[PDB]
Curated annotation (Swiss-Prot):
It comes from Gallus gallus. Lysozymes have primarily a bacteriolytic function; those in tissues and body fluids are associated with the monocyte-macrophage system and enhance the activity of immunoagents. Has bacteriolytic activity against M.luteus. This is Lysozyme C. GO terms for biological process: cell wall macromolecule catabolic process; defense response to bacterium; defense response to Gram-negative bacterium; defense response to Gram-positive bacterium; killing of cells of another organism. Belongs to the glycosyl hydrolase 22 family. Its main location: secreted.
Length: 129
């Protein structure tokens, strides 16, 4: 599913991301835009052999099992394919664990390089929330 901007904002708000660990909703929408262009089916292979999955590009080296990342962890206790669903619940629930682990949203390289320190409220402006 390719989400619209305000549709994704509303779904993330319903699932409890607005101000989660202090990160306003615009931060999460901005991260999703630059990680996946709002496409739940996005995948990208990394140099080390892990793969990033879904609308927030969650990595198989630590967070999910894809059966082909030897020696990896599965800290969200899910198959990585669950992160590609049109229902974003699994992605949101795993992202809450990631952002809680000490490094906040710096875990998402595109957030650090393209959202951090910008006017992220622009990403939800005009939306009915
Ligand atoms: Cl915001
Ligand atoms: Cl933080
Ligand atoms: Na894994």
């Amino acid at each position: 599913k390719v989400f619209g901007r305000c549709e994704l904002a509303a779904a993330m708000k319903r699932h409890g991301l607005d101000n989660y660990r202090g990160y306003s909703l615009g931060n999460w929408v901005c991260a999703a835009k630059f990680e996946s262009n709002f496409n739940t089916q996005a995948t990208n292979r990394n140099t080390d052999g892990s793969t990033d999955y879904g609308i927030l590009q969650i990595n198989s080296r630590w967070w999910c099992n894809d059966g082909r990342t030897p020696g990896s962890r599965n800290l969200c206790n899910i198959p990585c394919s669950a992160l590609l669903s049109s229902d974003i619940t699994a992605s949101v629930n795993c992202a809450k664990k990631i952002v809680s682990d000490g490094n906040g949203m710096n875990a998402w390289v595109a957030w650090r390089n393209r959202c951090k320190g910008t006017d992220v409220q622009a990403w939800i402006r005009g939306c009915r929330l």
